[PDB]
Amino acid sequence: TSLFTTADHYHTPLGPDGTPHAFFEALRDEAETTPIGWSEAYGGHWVVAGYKEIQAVIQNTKAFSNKGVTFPRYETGEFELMMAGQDDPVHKKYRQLVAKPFSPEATDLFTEQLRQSTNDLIDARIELGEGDAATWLANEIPARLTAILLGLPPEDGDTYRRWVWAITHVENPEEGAEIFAELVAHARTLIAERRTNPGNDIMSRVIMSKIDGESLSEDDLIGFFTILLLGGIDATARFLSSVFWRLAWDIELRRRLIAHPELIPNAVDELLRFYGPAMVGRLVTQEVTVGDITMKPGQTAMLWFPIASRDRSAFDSPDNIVIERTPNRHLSLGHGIHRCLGAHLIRVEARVAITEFLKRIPEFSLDPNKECEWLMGQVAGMLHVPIIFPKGKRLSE
Ligand code: HEM
C-alpha cells in the first residue's frame, strides 16, 4: 500500500486546492519510512523523495549519468541538451563558454530594464480590470528577457512557447518532432545571420567561441539555443504563474509583502522551495546502494524535489511559507555541477515581477467565474491564473 507503486510525475493527483500539493504533503510523509520507492509507470523506475537521499544522488557523478536527465527523453531529435544531458569533461568544458554572461554581475545589466517591461506590461490591462496573470504576465516577463539575451525578436512569445510545447512533450505522437524541426529551422536561420552582423547577446558570444582552439559545430550551437530557449521560458513562466495564484488568495501573504519589501528578495526563496516546478532524473551506470536500496545500471531514478523540499528533517514547519526562514537551502534549482545555470536570473525576475506587480495592483483575486488550470510534468505549475482587480490607472502615456 505505497504511493510509489504508481508514482508518476506527468500524472500527479490534484487536490481541491487545485494544486498537486495534497499529494506531495502525503507522499512527503511516506518517505520518512521509505525514502525511495519503485514505480510501475514508464516501464519501471525509481522515485527518490528523501532530502538526504536526493542529495546523495545529484552528488555521486560516478554512478549516475545526466545523459538521462529528461525522462521520458525530451523531443529533440539527434541533438543533446547542452550542459544538461552531458557529463564531464564535455560539461565542465561546454559550460565555461557561457559561465560569464550568466554571472550575477552580467545578469544585472538588465535589472532595471525588467521593471520597465514589467511595469510596461501592467499597462496592457491595468485599465480592463482582469486578465490571465499566467498568459498575460507570468509568460511574457521571462520570454521577452530571453529573446533579448539570445538576440531575438521580442514579440513571438507564442511561436516559441509552441516549440517548447513540443520539446516539453504533449503526449503527442511525433507532431512534437514536426514542430521541433521548426525550432531547428529558425535556430539555423538565426545562427547564420549572426556570424555576419553580430551583437552583444549570448547567442552571438558562443559562435565566435572555440573549444580546443577550433570553433564549434552548429549541432552544438543549435544545441545551446534549445537549452536556453527552454531554460528561461518554461520553468520560469510556470513558477511565476504560481506566485501570482498564490498572492491572489494568500492575502495574509500579499499584505505582508506589500508592507515589507526588504523581505521580497528573501521570501522569493521560500517560494522557490514551496513552488519549485523543477524535477529531474539521472541514469544508473553502475550498481550502487542508496540508503537501503540497490540500483542496477540501465534504470532511471527520478529526483522528486517538491517532495524533498518538504522533508521535516531539514525544514522547520515545511508546510507553511515562512518569509523569514533563514537559511533557505532547498533544491528547487538543484546542487552539484548541475546547479541551475540561470540560478541568479530568476531571483531577479521574481524580485521585480512581484515587487512591481504589487505596487501597481495592490488588490486582485482569483476570478470566481473562471477556474485555474495546473500544468504537470518535469515542469509543473499554474498555466492559467485569471484574477479580478479594481480597474486602475497606467503610467504609460
Ligand atoms: C524558475 C525557473 C528555473 C528553474 C526552477 C530551473 C531549474 C533548474 C534545475 C533543477 C537545474 C539542475 C538540474 C540538475 O542538477 O541536473 C537547472 C539546470 C539548468 N538550467 Fe535552470 N531553471 C530555471 C531557470 C533557468 C533559466 C532562466 C535559465 C536560462 C538561461 C536556466 C538554464 C539552465 C541550464 C542550461 C541548466 C543546465 C546546466 C547545468 O545546470 O549544469 N535555468 N535549472
Ligand SMILES: CC1(C)O[C@]2(C)CC[C@H]1CC2
Ligand atoms: C529539461 C529540464 C527538465 O528543464 C530545466 C528548466 C530544469 C532541469 C532540466 C534542464 C533545464
